Amino acid sequence: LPYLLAWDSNIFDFTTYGLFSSDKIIFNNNITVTTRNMYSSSDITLRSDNNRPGDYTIKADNIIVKNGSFIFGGNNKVVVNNLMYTKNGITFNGNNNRLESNSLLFSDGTISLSGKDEIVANALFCDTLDIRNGSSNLVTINEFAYFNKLNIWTDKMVLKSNSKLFGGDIEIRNDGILSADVGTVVYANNLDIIGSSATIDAPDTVLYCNNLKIDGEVKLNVKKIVCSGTITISNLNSGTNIRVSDKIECRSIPQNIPSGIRNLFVQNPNVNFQIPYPTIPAIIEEIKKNTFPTNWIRLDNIVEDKKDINGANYYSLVSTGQNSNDINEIFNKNKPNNPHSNVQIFVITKSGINVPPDQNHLDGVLIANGSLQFNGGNLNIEYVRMPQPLIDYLLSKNIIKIENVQPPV
């Protein structure tokens, strides 16, 4: 069942994607995207929202950045119901951003906050989670975070009830705050808490580490610490702000402990633990395989242009990219000065797609082997399923393949 976390067979169905690029997706200021699935190979870049009328910048079921990062620009609000995956990280800029991930957030890279940024996650996997820049950040964990490195150097990370941290090393310094509710557990290799403002406020939490380093009059309020390796203490003279309601159980009680906390320590030379790391979800395994996405979407199978799959409320284009102007030509079928008469637009192309700056409302799908670049802002994008005659065409040419994918067991 942990193997099936965030499994979504529509990931492999390219008729469920509103935006796809085999290179980059470059947004512009004040774009609001409502989509089902979105894929990019290289980076997806947002710009700052300084005049965005929407509740959200992007609302999606799934966002996948197979060979790139996801870059925030400022005041962007992103909601991903199922999974957000990036290879190379998630980089917050500009402050005031929000990322809401309701099942799985996974990066092979660094997730880095800027200040006044919020992440609300259920399961989170990453190489490094940086809560260091600015102040008034908030990373809330509903199930777990699993990481090689967690740096908390400002406010804050909250562990909701019964959630877990799986490290990796954890380093809290400067104004770093880790707060944790009932039933929480923290596992780490190295756990370092440095200075008089570094805080763990987790009175019901058990912390397991190999090495524990405390430098200064840290603020620790926890239930139990287990240390199987070495406890290194320095600049610790009173320990007034170290509260441990059960015990610090450790392989070797360290020398020169202040007398007022000496009581806390209990020596157990055999103390040991084996961290019960979550398995990598099957969906992530499959996304990372070289079969994805080209088993199911093959833009190189576009060997002819198809320009007559149009209807009363839509225009389509399947383009080899030989004619530069065909893409401007389809976009000009939508007058931005006439809202109620908006028609749907479906573009599938071996070229990139540069969306003209006068577009302000697009319903449909944009699928490009080159980059997808919005040359303007102040635009609302909403996914609409491709018309059936277009899907049938794409399938006939094996530009897409739809397979009866099932969750593995």
Assign 282 to helix, strand or coil. Answer: helix
Q: Smallest gap, in angstroms, from Cβ of residue 15 to Zn ion?
A: 18
Residue 183 is inside which H or E element, if any? Answer: none
Q: List residues bridging with 172 in a β-sheet.
A: 152, 193
Q: Work out the number of other CB atoms within 10 angstroms of the CB of residue 384.
A: 16
Residue 82 in contact with residue 6, Cβ under 8 Å? Answer: yes
- Residue 361 annotated as part of some ligand binding site: yes
Q: List residues bridging with 38 in a β-sheet.
A: 19, 63
Q: Smallest gap, in angstroms, from Cβ of residue 101 to Zn ion?
A: 25
**Cα 277–Cα 148–Cα 82 angle in degrees, nearest 5:** 65
Q: Which two tokens stand for residue 195?
A: 């200075």
Binding positions for Zn ion, 130-169, rule CB under 5 A: none
Residue 158 in contact with residue 177, Cβ under 8 Å? Answer: no
Integer CA distances (angstroms), 361 to 50, 195, 312, 377, in order: 18, 52, 18, 11
User: Among residues 181 and 382, whose Cβ is nearest to Zn ion?
Assistant: 382
User: How buried is residue 341: exposed, middle or buried, by Cβ count under 10 Å (0-12/13-18/19+)?
Assistant: exposed
User: Among residues 336 and 370, whose Cβ is nearest to Zn ion?
Assistant: 336
- Residue 358 annotated as part of some ligand binding site: no
Residues with Cβ within 8 Å of 193's Cβ and at least 6 positions away in sequence, in order, are: 172, 173, 200, 213, 214, 215, 218, 220
- Residue 382 annotated as part of some ligand binding site: yes
User: Among residues 343 and 405, whose Cβ is nearest to Zn ion?
Assistant: 343
Q: Smallest gap, in angstroms, from Cβ of residue 81 to Zn ion?
A: 19
Total of chain residues touching Zn ion, rule CB under 5 A:
2
Q: Helices H, strands E: what count in the chain?
A: 3, 31
The per-residue DSSP string of 367-404 comes to EESS-EEES--SEEEEE-PPPHHHHHHHHHTTSB----
User: Among residues 33 and 188, whose Cβ is nearest to Zn ion?
Assistant: 33
Q: Smallest gap, in angstroms, from Cβ of residue 342 to Zn ion?
A: 7
Q: Smallest gap, in angstroms, from Cβ of residue 388 to Zn ion?
A: 20
Q: Smallest gap, in angstroms, from Cβ of residue 364 to Zn ion?
A: 9
Contact region with Zn ion (CB under 5 A), list: 71-79, 233-241, 350-358, 375-383: 375-383
User: Among residues 100 and 363, whose Cβ is nearest to Zn ion?
Assistant: 363
User: Among residues 23 and 363, whose Cβ is nearest to Zn ion?
Assistant: 363
**Cα 68–Cα 357–Cα 19 angle in degrees, nearest 5:** 35
Binding positions for Zn ion, 335-364, rule CB under 5 A: 363
User: Among residues 262 and 361, whose Cβ is nearest to Zn ion?
Assistant: 361
What residue number has its CB nearest to Zn ion?
382
Q: Smallest gap, in angstroms, from Cβ of residue 360 to Zn ion?
A: 10
Q: List residues bridging with 348 in a β-sheet.
A: 318, 367
Residues with Cβ within 8 Å of 326's Cβ and at least 6 positions away in sequence, in order, are: 305, 307, 317, 319
Per CB under 5 A, 382 contacts Zn ion: yes
> How close are the terminal C-alpha atoms of the chain, in Å?
9
User: Among residues 262 and 333, whose Cβ is nearest to Zn ion?
Assistant: 333
Q: Which residues are annotated as a binding site for Zn(2+)?
A: 361, 363, 382
Binding residues (CB under 5 A) for Zn ion: these are: 363, 382
Q: Which residues are annotated as a binding site?
A: 361, 363, 382
